[PDB]
Design a protein around this motif. Structure first.
Motif, PDB file in Angstrom:
ATOM      1  N   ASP A  10       0.765  -1.216   0.000  1.00  0.00           N
ATOM      2  CA  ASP A  10       0.000   0.000   0.000  1.00  0.00           C
ATOM      3  C   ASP A  10       0.817   1.299   0.000  1.00  0.00           C
ATOM      4  OD1 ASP A  10      -2.436  -1.277  -0.122  1.00  0.00           O
ATOM      5  OD2 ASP A  10      -2.709  -1.340   2.093  1.00  0.00           O
ATOM      6  N   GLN A 105      -2.058   4.702   8.332  1.00  0.00           N
ATOM      7  CA  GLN A 105      -2.270   5.755   7.342  1.00  0.00           C
ATOM      8  C   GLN A 105      -2.900   7.026   7.902  1.00  0.00           C
ATOM      9  OE1 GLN A 105      -5.036   4.801   4.072  1.00  0.00           O
ATOM     10  NE2 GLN A 105      -4.515   6.673   3.004  1.00  0.00           N
ATOM     11  N   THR A 142      -7.972   8.127  -1.908  1.00  0.00           N
ATOM     12  CA  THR A 142      -7.107   7.039  -2.363  1.00  0.00           C
ATOM     13  C   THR A 142      -7.987   5.859  -2.526  1.00  0.00           C
ATOM     14  OG1 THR A 142      -6.762   6.691  -0.031  1.00  0.00           O
ATOM     15  CG2 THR A 142      -5.044   7.826  -1.241  1.00  0.00           C
ATOM     16  N   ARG A 145      -6.431   1.930  -2.685  1.00  0.00           N
ATOM     17  CA  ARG A 145      -5.927   1.501  -1.401  1.00  0.00           C
ATOM     18  C   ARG A 145      -7.134   1.331  -0.448  1.00  0.00           C
ATOM     19  NH1 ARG A 145      -1.758   3.773   2.481  1.00  0.00           N
ATOM     20  NH2 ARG A 145      -1.832   2.379   4.333  1.00  0.00           N
ATOM     21  N   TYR A 161      -5.068  -8.542  -1.769  1.00  0.00           N
ATOM     22  CA  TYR A 161      -3.638  -8.317  -1.816  1.00  0.00           C
ATOM     23  C   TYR A 161      -2.888  -9.409  -2.495  1.00  0.00           C
ATOM     24  CZ  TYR A 161      -4.097  -4.474   1.319  1.00  0.00           C
ATOM     25  OH  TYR A 161      -4.429  -3.242   1.924  1.00  0.00           O
TER      26      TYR A 161
END
Ligand SMILES: [Cl-]
Ligand SMILES: [Cl-]
Length: 162
Positions: A10, A105, A142, A145, A161
Protein backbone atom coordinates in the motif's frame (compact mmCIF):
# COMPACT_ATOMS: atom_id res chain seq x y z
CA UNK A 1 0.83 -12.34 3.98
CA UNK A 2 1.41 -10.19 7.07
CA UNK A 3 1.01 -6.58 8.22
CA UNK A 4 4.45 -5.57 6.91
CA UNK A 5 3.87 -7.03 3.42
CA UNK A 6 0.47 -5.51 3.38
CA UNK A 7 1.65 -2.01 4.26
CA UNK A 8 4.65 -2.32 1.92
CA UNK A 9 2.21 -2.94 -0.91
CA UNK A 10 0.00 0.00 0.00
CA UNK A 11 2.72 2.56 0.73
CA UNK A 12 5.67 1.79 -1.52
CA UNK A 13 9.32 2.27 -0.60
CA UNK A 14 10.97 5.57 -1.28
CA UNK A 15 14.50 6.52 -0.29
CA UNK A 16 14.13 10.25 -1.06
CA UNK A 17 11.93 12.86 0.65
CA UNK A 18 8.76 12.94 -1.38
CA UNK A 19 5.35 14.25 -1.17
CA UNK A 20 2.48 12.04 -0.25
CA UNK A 21 -0.86 12.07 -1.96
CA UNK A 22 -1.88 15.02 0.24
CA UNK A 23 1.26 17.03 -0.58
CA UNK A 24 3.02 16.15 2.64
CA UNK A 25 6.62 15.49 3.07
CA UNK A 26 7.16 11.71 3.50
CA UNK A 27 9.99 9.21 3.22
CA UNK A 28 10.52 5.41 3.38
CA UNK A 29 7.45 3.24 3.73
CA UNK A 30 4.78 5.84 4.42
CA UNK A 31 6.65 7.74 7.15
CA UNK A 32 5.11 11.20 7.39
CA UNK A 33 7.75 13.76 8.10
CA UNK A 34 5.80 17.06 8.35
CA UNK A 35 2.59 18.77 7.42
CA UNK A 36 4.55 21.88 6.73
CA UNK A 37 5.15 23.39 3.30
CA UNK A 38 8.74 23.72 4.14
CA UNK A 39 11.12 21.33 2.54
CA UNK A 40 13.48 22.43 5.19
CA UNK A 41 11.22 21.74 8.03
CA UNK A 42 11.16 18.21 6.38
CA UNK A 43 14.89 17.71 6.02
CA UNK A 44 15.33 18.65 9.62
CA UNK A 45 12.63 16.39 10.96
CA UNK A 46 14.30 13.80 8.91
CA UNK A 47 17.76 14.13 10.51
CA UNK A 48 16.15 14.22 13.91
CA UNK A 49 14.30 10.95 13.14
CA UNK A 50 17.41 9.14 11.73
CA UNK A 51 19.99 10.65 13.98
CA UNK A 52 22.27 11.74 11.18
CA UNK A 53 22.66 14.23 8.45
CA UNK A 54 20.70 12.73 5.70
CA UNK A 55 20.07 15.61 3.44
CA UNK A 56 16.78 14.02 2.40
CA UNK A 57 18.17 10.65 1.63
CA UNK A 58 18.06 7.47 3.63
CA UNK A 59 19.15 3.89 3.11
CA UNK A 60 16.89 0.76 2.92
CA UNK A 61 17.92 -0.29 6.41
CA UNK A 62 16.87 3.14 7.64
CA UNK A 63 13.51 2.92 5.87
CA UNK A 64 12.80 -0.43 7.50
CA UNK A 65 13.84 0.87 10.92
CA UNK A 66 11.31 3.71 10.69
CA UNK A 67 8.74 1.20 9.42
CA UNK A 68 9.22 -1.08 12.35
CA UNK A 69 8.79 1.85 14.68
CA UNK A 70 5.62 3.08 13.02
CA UNK A 71 3.87 -0.35 12.93
CA UNK A 72 4.70 -0.80 16.60
CA UNK A 73 3.50 2.70 17.44
CA UNK A 74 0.24 1.98 15.48
CA UNK A 75 -0.41 -1.26 17.29
CA UNK A 76 0.30 0.21 20.77
CA UNK A 77 -1.78 3.23 19.90
CA UNK A 78 -4.77 1.06 19.13
CA UNK A 79 -4.32 -1.00 22.33
CA UNK A 80 -4.29 2.13 24.50
CA UNK A 81 -7.19 3.74 22.75
CA UNK A 82 -10.58 3.40 24.51
CA UNK A 83 -12.37 3.50 21.19
CA UNK A 84 -10.13 1.29 19.10
CA UNK A 85 -9.21 -1.40 21.56
CA UNK A 86 -12.64 -2.99 21.91
CA UNK A 87 -12.97 -3.15 18.09
CA UNK A 88 -9.53 -4.65 17.71
CA UNK A 89 -10.23 -7.20 20.44
CA UNK A 90 -13.46 -8.31 18.78
CA UNK A 91 -11.83 -8.96 15.41
CA UNK A 92 -10.21 -12.04 13.77
CA UNK A 93 -6.51 -11.83 12.73
CA UNK A 94 -6.94 -10.59 9.11
CA UNK A 95 -9.41 -7.90 9.97
CA UNK A 96 -7.11 -6.81 12.77
CA UNK A 97 -4.48 -6.16 10.09
CA UNK A 98 -7.00 -4.00 8.21
CA UNK A 99 -7.53 -1.82 11.31
CA UNK A 100 -3.79 -1.49 11.79
CA UNK A 101 -3.51 -0.48 8.18
CA UNK A 102 -6.00 2.38 8.59
CA UNK A 103 -4.36 3.51 11.82
CA UNK A 104 -0.96 3.58 10.19
CA UNK A 105 -2.27 5.76 7.34
CA UNK A 106 -4.63 8.07 9.19
CA UNK A 107 -3.51 8.08 12.79
CA UNK A 108 -5.40 6.94 15.90
CA UNK A 109 -7.54 10.10 15.99
CA UNK A 110 -8.72 9.82 12.36
CA UNK A 111 -9.86 6.20 12.64
CA UNK A 112 -11.49 6.75 16.02
CA UNK A 113 -13.69 9.24 14.21
CA UNK A 114 -15.26 6.53 12.03
CA UNK A 115 -17.81 5.97 14.80
CA UNK A 116 -20.50 4.22 12.78
CA UNK A 117 -18.13 1.96 10.82
CA UNK A 118 -16.45 1.01 14.11
CA UNK A 119 -19.82 -0.01 15.57
CA UNK A 120 -20.67 -2.10 12.59
CA UNK A 121 -17.38 -3.90 12.60
CA UNK A 122 -17.69 -4.66 16.22
CA UNK A 123 -21.19 -5.92 15.41
CA UNK A 124 -19.74 -8.16 12.66
CA UNK A 125 -21.91 -6.56 10.00
CA UNK A 126 -19.35 -6.87 7.27
CA UNK A 127 -21.36 -5.75 4.30
CA UNK A 128 -22.80 -2.78 5.99
CA UNK A 129 -19.43 -1.74 7.38
CA UNK A 130 -17.95 -1.82 3.84
CA UNK A 131 -20.61 0.45 2.50
CA UNK A 132 -20.19 2.92 5.34
CA UNK A 133 -16.35 3.05 5.18
CA UNK A 134 -16.67 4.02 1.45
CA UNK A 135 -18.57 7.16 2.32
CA UNK A 136 -15.50 9.03 3.35
CA UNK A 137 -12.96 11.47 2.15
CA UNK A 138 -10.44 8.65 2.65
CA UNK A 139 -12.17 6.48 0.10
CA UNK A 140 -12.54 9.38 -2.38
CA UNK A 141 -8.90 10.45 -2.04
CA UNK A 142 -7.11 7.04 -2.36
CA UNK A 143 -9.75 4.75 -3.78
CA UNK A 144 -7.67 1.73 -4.81
CA UNK A 145 -5.93 1.50 -1.40
CA UNK A 146 -9.20 2.13 0.44
CA UNK A 147 -10.94 -0.62 -1.63
CA UNK A 148 -8.27 -3.14 -0.76
CA UNK A 149 -8.64 -2.34 2.99
CA UNK A 150 -12.46 -2.36 2.75
CA UNK A 151 -12.50 -5.75 0.96
CA UNK A 152 -10.22 -7.01 3.71
CA UNK A 153 -12.83 -5.97 6.25
CA UNK A 154 -15.67 -7.38 4.16
CA UNK A 155 -14.27 -10.79 3.48
CA UNK A 156 -11.75 -11.44 6.24
CA UNK A 157 -9.26 -12.85 3.74
CA UNK A 158 -6.12 -11.49 1.92
CA UNK A 159 -7.72 -11.72 -1.49
CA UNK A 160 -7.34 -8.06 -2.30
CA UNK A 161 -3.64 -8.32 -1.82
CA UNK A 162 -2.85 -11.46 -3.55
CL1 LIG B 1 -19.16 10.52 0.84
CL1 LIG C 1 -5.04 4.58 -3.96
Amino acid sequence: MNIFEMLRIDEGLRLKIYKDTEGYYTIGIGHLLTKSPSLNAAKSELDKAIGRNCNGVITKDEAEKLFNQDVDAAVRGILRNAKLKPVYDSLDAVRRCALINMVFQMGETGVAGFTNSLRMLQQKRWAAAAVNLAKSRWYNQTPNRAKRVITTFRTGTWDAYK
